[PDB]
């Protein structure tokens, strides 16, 4: 079995910024989700490997974890709030189309997903 490369979270060719809405993605959003009890399996890339799915990357073509976010975030990967936030709606997604509904790891998404939610809802408006 193999896992593909993970996403990428350097390029020097990119445009970066660092914005106070993604500042508070990392300080508010990231770090919320990242101290949940139910964070562990969405903080790193899924290895199917250790896991024993070896479709998981058959199925999921645009794979995104926390693990990324975080470094993405701690190493201004992004340029705007929006690549961001997308980044996490991926991650649930992935999560919810792989899994079946009322599994673990689904009941695990939909409770990081509230918070997500309640923590955008309060996105700061860009200086
Ligand atoms: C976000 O992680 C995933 O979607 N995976 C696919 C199968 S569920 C499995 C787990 C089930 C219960 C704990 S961990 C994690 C890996």
């Known amino acids: 079995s193999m896992n593909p490369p993970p996403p990428e979270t350097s390029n020097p060719n990119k445009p970066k910024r660092q914005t106070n809405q993604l500042q508070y993605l990392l300080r508010v959003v990231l770090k919320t989700l990242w101290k949940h009890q139910f964070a562990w399996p969405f903080q790193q890339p899924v290895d199917a490997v250790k896991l024993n799915l070896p479709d998981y990357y ?16 701690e190493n201004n990967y992004y340029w705007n709030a929006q690549e961001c936030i997308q980044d996490f709606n991926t991650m649930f997604t992935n999560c919810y189309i792989y899994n079946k509904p009322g599994d673990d790891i689904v009941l695990m998404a939909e409770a990081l997903e509230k918070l997500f939610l309640q923590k955008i809802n309060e996105l700061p408006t860009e200086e």
Request: positive net charge; proline residues 6%; without cysteine.
């Open 58 to 73: 058959k199925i999921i073509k645009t794979p995104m974890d926390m693990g990324t976010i975080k470094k993405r975030l």
